[PDB]
Amino acid sequence: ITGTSTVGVGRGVLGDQKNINTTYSTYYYLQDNTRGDGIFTYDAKYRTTLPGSLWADADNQFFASYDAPAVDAHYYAGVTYDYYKNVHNRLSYDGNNAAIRSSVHYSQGYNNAFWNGSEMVYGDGDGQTFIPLSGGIDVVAHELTHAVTDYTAGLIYQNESGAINEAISDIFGTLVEFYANKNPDWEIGEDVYTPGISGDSLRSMSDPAKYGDPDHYSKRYTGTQDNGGVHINSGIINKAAYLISQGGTHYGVSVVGIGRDKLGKIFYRALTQYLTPTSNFSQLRAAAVQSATDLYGSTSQEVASVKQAFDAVGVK
Ligand SMILES: N[C@@H](CCCC[NH3+])C(=O)O
Ligand SMILES: [Ca+2]
Ligand SMILES: [Ca+2]
Ligand SMILES: [Ca+2]
Numbered sequence: 383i384t385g386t387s388t389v390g391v392g393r394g395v396l397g398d399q400k401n402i403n404t405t406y407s408t409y410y411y412l413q414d415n416t417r418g419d420g421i422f423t424y425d426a427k428y429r430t431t432l433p434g435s436l437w438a439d440a441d442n443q444f445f446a447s448y449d450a451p452a453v454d455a456h457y458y459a460g461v462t463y464d465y466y467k468n469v470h471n472r473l474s475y476d477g478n479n480a481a482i483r484s485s486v487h488y489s490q491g492y493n494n495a496f497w498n499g500s501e502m503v504y505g506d507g508d509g510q511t512f513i514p515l516s517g518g519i520d521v522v523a524h525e526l527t528h529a530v531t532d533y534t535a536g537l538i539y540q541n542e543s544g545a546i547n548e549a550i551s552d553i554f555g556t557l558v559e560f561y562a563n564k565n566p567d568w569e570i571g572e573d574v575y576t577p578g579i580s581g582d583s584l585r586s587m588s589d590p591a592k593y594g595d596p597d598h599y600s601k602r603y604t605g606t607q608d609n610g611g612v613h614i615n616s617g618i619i620n621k622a623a624y625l626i627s628q629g630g631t632h633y634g635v636s637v638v639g640i641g642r643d644k645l646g647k648i649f650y651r652a653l654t655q656y657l658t659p660t661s662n663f664s665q666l667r668a669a670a671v672q673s674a675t676d677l678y679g680s681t682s683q684e685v686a687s688v689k690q691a692f693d694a695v696g697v698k
């Protein structure tokens with residue numbers, strides 16, 4: 383924990399070199415003291431005990447294959463911290479510079495990642511369905527966003543409430559991806575999903591139906607799986623957000639896009655000032671309408687475009 387701030391260099395999951403903020407005290411640790419109360423990255427050592435051990439490195443160079451997932455979890459956590467601070471004036475997930483902790487090499491062959499109420503956790507994937515999941519900046523930011531949601535709206539992880547929770551994570555994960563600006567898109571998880579299949583992703587915001595997700599309230603999943611479809615019905619909200627930002631005509635409804643920055647401002651406002659644990663899609667629409675009204679005014683294009691976007695996905 384206590385030491386002097388250093389800068390190491392390493393290679394991520396996709397093979398790019400980057401600098402990472404580390405801490406030196408006998409070993410060099412993945413502990414970034416430059417952001418809030420720190421970003422801390424841990425090795426779960428293929429087990430499921432959390433957090434595992436604060437990541438220690440003898441020489442401050444992180445180019446081993448074992449190193450790569452840790453490099454990206456640490457680095458992309460910094461990027462995501464930077465987005466929230468610079469764009470939304472938010473200091474870490476709780477708004478009070480809480481330490482951000484992530485563990486990598488969780489379990490063996492684990493095809494997923496998550497926020498467990500206290501930290502981020504990333505599987506290495508089985509190498510067929512996924513490569514290590516911290517390799518996707520949209521994935522890291524999706525997970526950290528769950529932390530932001532837990533401390534703000536606190537959307538319950540079930541049915542419509544839980545689909546909004548998910549969509550907020552896909553929205554901000556994407557807006558983070560655009561912020562770092564590498565090869566950004568409106569898809570989710572493309573950098574780490576199915577190496578060896580080109581062009582696919584876990585979910586699409588631009589066309590949720592591409593991967594079996596609803597793009598209209600009329601096609602909402604009403605069953606029991608996936609906590610009442612939280613990763614499925616998120617499609618409806620993802621599509622609304624895509625339309626607000628990028629524009630389009632969808633089931634005959636025309637939406638004039640207002641761009642990514644304003645989408646982010648509206649949904650961050652909604653998230654932090656209007657939504658509640660029990661909010662449903664209709665309540666989301668009104669929160670987004672009030673937010674856009676606060677920011678741009680009653681008669682703005684921005685308000686009209688929020689309304690059209692929700693009309694287009696069948697949410698009144
Ligand atoms: N993150 C999503 C999809 C991950 C893929 C499931 N192996 C979920 O937990 O449902
Ligand atoms: Ca090393
Ligand atoms: Ca991308
Ligand atoms: Ca993406």
Ligand SMILES: [Ca+2]
Pocket residue numbers: 572574575576577578579580581582583
């Ligand atoms: Ca793929």
Ligand SMILES: [Zn+2]
Pocket residue numbers: 524525528548551
């Ligand atoms: Zn999620």
